[PDB]
Amino acid sequence: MISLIAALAVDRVIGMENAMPWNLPADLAWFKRNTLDKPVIMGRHTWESIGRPLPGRKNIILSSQPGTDDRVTWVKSVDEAIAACGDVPEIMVIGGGRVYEQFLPKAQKLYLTHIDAEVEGDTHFPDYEPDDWESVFSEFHDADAQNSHSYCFEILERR
């Protein structure tokens, strides 16, 4: 099974200048809980944005060019990325925009954080058809001293 996980600001913005402007520790905690001990697939720009391997996960990087770091696994196509995960129950696709677009048609599950923040961005989450998805989990949180915006965790499953 292929799942996507992403944090979206208003208007589906997911990044600006290869970074995420906001800081929401609760959402990073949610990201770690849902990806730990699973393979994670990311594009090369997102790999450069994170800046180091994510521990406790098999890190698979998509790039058309040869790899430059043997702490992670480099692949050159979507089919190769899936094959490199082996026979696991759940593959996590962690972005960015171009990678989300390619894996959305294959995905059975979306883990989305909706952040109540208005951010100028240059990268967006794909425009997905709402009729294809059932919301199976929703959890809203007001802002607090550690998290400067309200946010909603949502899990969607393909109908």
Ligand SMILES: NC(=O)c1ccc[n+]([C@@H]2O[C@H](COP(=O)([O-])OP(=O)(O)OC[C@H]3O[C@@H](n4cnc5c(N)ncnc54)[C@H](OP(=O)(O)O)[C@@H]3O)[C@@H](O)[C@H]2O)c1
């Ligand atoms: N809010 C969130 O949840 C979230 C999550 C992830 C990322 N982001 C943000 O997203 C932005 C980056 O997204 P992005 O769309 O610019 O880049 P990206 O999707 O992370 O990476 C694109 C690169 O990945 C390679 N690639 C993608 N598909 C490939 C394929 N089929 N075969 C071979 N290589 C492939 C290519 O690398 P080469 O050019 O080397 O060939 C391509 O240039 C950043 O701002 C990041 O902070 C946000």
Ligand SMILES: Nc1nc(=O)c2nc(CNc3ccc(C(=O)N[C@@H](CCC(=O)O)C(=O)O)cc3)cnc2[nH]1
């Ligand atoms: N919901 C969600 N939120 C995000 O911030 C997010 N970010 C990415 C890509 N960017 C990043 C950037 C940093 C870390 C990171 O440092 N994560 C640590 C958290 C450690 C902690 O919480 O202190 C990790 O171990 O997962 C992960 C992904 C992909 N999907 C996401 N999905």
Ligand SMILES: [Mn+2]
């Ligand atoms: Mn806000």
